[PDB]
A paper describes a structure:
Here, we determine atomic structures by cryo-electron microscopy of three conjugative pili, two from hyperthermophilic archaea (Aeropyrum pernix and Pyrobaculum calidifontis) and one encoded by the Ti plasmid of the bacterium Agrobacterium tumefaciens, and show that the archaeal pili are homologous to bacterial mating pili. With structures for four bacterial conjugation pili (pED208, F, pKpQIL, and pTiC58 from A. tumefaciens) and two archaeal ones (A. pernix and P. calidifontis), it is clear that there is a common architecture for all and obvious homology, despite negligible sequence similarity. Each prokaryotic pilin subunit consists of two or three hydrophobic α-helices, with kinks appearing in some of the helices, such as in A. pernix and A. tumefaciens. Hence, pore diameters of all prokaryotic conjugative pili are sufficiently wide for the passage of ssDNA, but not dsDNA.
Numbering used by the authors:
A (entry chain B), B (entry chain A), C (entry chain K): 2 to 85
The structure:
Amino acid sequence: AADIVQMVEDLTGKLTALAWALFLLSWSIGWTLRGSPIPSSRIKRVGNSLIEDSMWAALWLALGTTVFAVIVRLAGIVNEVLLG
Amino acid sequence: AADIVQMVEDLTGKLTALAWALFLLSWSIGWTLRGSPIPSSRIKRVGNSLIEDSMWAALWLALGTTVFAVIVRLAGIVNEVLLG
Amino acid sequence: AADIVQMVEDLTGKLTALAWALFLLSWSIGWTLRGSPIPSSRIKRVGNSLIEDSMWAALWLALGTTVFAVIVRLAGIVNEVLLG
Ligand SMILES: CC(C)CCC[C@@H](C)CCC[C@H](C)CCC[C@@H](C)CCC[C@@H](C)CCOC[C@@H](COP(=O)(O)O)OC[C@@H](C)CCC[C@H](C)CCC[C@H](C)CCC[C@@H](C)CCCC(C)C
Ligand SMILES: CC(C)CCC[C@@H](C)CCC[C@H](C)CCC[C@@H](C)CCC[C@@H](C)CCOC[C@@H](COP(=O)(O)O)OC[C@@H](C)CCC[C@H](C)CCC[C@H](C)CCC[C@@H](C)CCCC(C)C
Ligand SMILES: CC(C)CCC[C@@H](C)CCC[C@H](C)CCC[C@H](C)CCC[C@@H](C)CO[C@@H](COCC[C@H](C)CCC[C@@H](C)CCC[C@@H](C)CCC[C@@H](C)CCCC(C)C)COP(=O)(O)O
Ligand SMILES: CC(C)CCC[C@@H](C)CCC[C@H](C)CCC[C@H](C)CCC[C@@H](C)CO[C@@H](COCC[C@H](C)CCC[C@@H](C)CCC[C@@H](C)CCC[C@@H](C)CCCC(C)C)COP(=O)(O)O
Ligand SMILES: CC(C)CCC[C@@H](C)CCC[C@H](C)CCC[C@H](C)CCC[C@@H](C)CO[C@@H](COCC[C@H](C)CCC[C@@H](C)CCC[C@@H](C)CCC[C@@H](C)CCCC(C)C)COP(=O)(O)O
Ligand SMILES: CC(C)CCC[C@@H](C)CCC[C@H](C)CCC[C@H](C)CCC[C@@H](C)CO[C@@H](COCC[C@H](C)CCC[C@@H](C)CCC[C@@H](C)CCC[C@@H](C)CCCC(C)C)COP(=O)(O)O
């Protein structure tokens, strides 16, 4: 009943730690591709996409941890509006 | 007679708690897939679908808790219209 | 659970060492192309792009190591703002 929620939360915590590690790894890979001697352009594009997505997701993770409470508040507001 | 309704409501409550936990887990999985070093596109698509469905359902759950009262009100209105 | 994070961090460390080495190599290649007897202009342009990207990435690597903590702080601030 509740142990299932507890184990789901533990899984989410471990996944979040791994996600921070992987985000840093992706940032490093992107900025390493961008500075290498290879003068290609496709690889610069790949590095840019990597670092940009890394920053984006790293921001949005904790923001989503907040987003769900925000959505609950919006549900409360619309319920109070429609039903007095 | 009434204990059956009570146990159904308890089941719904436990399920709702588990559902919030799983929604947060899905959000984390999606945003982890989106920021990983893998430069594939299918996986970015999967992550986008995950996070979008997560937000959608997280909104619609409590909204539905309201939706059923809204539907009852609509039934009352149409009954009052058709039968004076 | 945690050994996976540890090995990801070790991979990032090795990659960072290699990245510093490659940045120095790219700087050397660029400044060697720029001073060679060849009077072409396209090659001067290539050397300029190489040395500029090298300096840029060499700066941004450690800065990003800080950027992720900065983003976490911004997430904390916006969470505190939206939810009292
Ligand atoms: C990769 C990812 C998929 C996994 C990651 C995370 C993993 C690590 C966790 C694994 C999660 C697992 C697969 C799903 C959870 C199990 C569900 C069925 C819980 C239902 C809620 C549950 C707490 C209710 C408690 O039962 C009431 C008990 C009293 O117990 P108590 O008083 O505490 O002693 O009543 C006794 C019996 C005799 C009552 C019989 C009624 C019967 C049980 C009704 C069925 C309930 C419902 C119809 C099931 C539907 C749930 C699914 C739609 C959700 C599945 C999500 C899935 C995609 C992961
Ligand atoms: C090039 C680059 C791609 C690589 C560079 C770096 C490389 C060198 C590292 C390689 C990284 C590898 C490929 C991905 C990591 C593995 C993931 C699945 C970890 C999930 C998190 C994990 C710690 C949780 C721990 O499990 C809980 C255990 C208890 O264990 P314990 O208590 O410690 O004994 O529960 C027992 C079972 C029976 C529970 C069953 C539930 C089941 C496990 C749920 C699935 C979990 C989740 C849905 C997986 C989704 C994760 C992916 C979206 C992320 C992949 C990123 C990828 C692009 C690299
Ligand atoms: C697609 C990638 C995955 C390819 C990856 C390949 C890589 C893994 C292979 C490892 C290193 C390779 C040996 C690189 C070979 C580079 C060739 C000269 C091909 C040039 C590419 C074509 C399309 C040109 O398109 C780009 C223009 O630059 C010109 C490149 C410098 C301007 C040359 C340098 C100019 C002269 C001085 C070179 C001297 C010749 C030999 C003595 C040097 C060794 C030759 C050689 C053994 C090593 C090459 C070391 C590189 C870093 C200089 C932009 O083109 P664009 O932006 O698209 O418009
Ligand atoms: C479908 C997925 C489930 C596949 C998952 C596989 C994954 C679980 C396996 C783990 C890691 C793999 C070893 C990834 C291997 C990547 C190959 C180079 C295949 C490229 C994919 C094909 C279709 C290209 O399509 C995409 C273009 O990017 C180019 C990728 C970079 C631009 C390369 C990097 C370029 C050069 C510098 C690489 C240097 C070679 C070795 C020294 C590095 C190690 C090689 C290697 C051991 C690890 C690869 C680390 C990745 C993150 C860089 C877009 O293609 P598209 O968007 O579709 O148009
Ligand atoms: C499915 C719907 C029913 C979902 C409805 C949810 C809704 C009822 C909830 C109410 C408001 C929510 C709090 C929205 C949260 C938005 C998240 C950032 C998720 C982004 C969605 C993912 C898939 C991205 O996919 C789309 C790309 O845009 C990026 C969005 C802007 C570009 C961000 C804005 C960028 C930065 C500056 C935001 C700053 C962060 C906080 C300080 C702001 C508050 C955060 C927050 C509390 C409110 C969000 C206010 C929105 C209107 C900006 C296209 O993706 P696609 O077109 O598919 O390829
Ligand atoms: C695109 C590159 C990858 C090409 C790389 C080629 C390279 C790997 C080949 C190795 C060395 C070559 C033998 C270079 C040959 C240079 C030719 C004279 C072509 C001139 C280029 C055209 C477009 C002119 O455009 C540029 C103007 O300068 C004029 C060059 C000096 C001003 C000449 C020197 C003038 C007189 C005194 C030369 C005497 C002739 C022979 C006795 C000398 C040996 C000839 C020869 C065997 C070696 C050349 C040694 C170079 C470093 C001087 C700017 O033009 P721009 O800036 O664009 O407006």
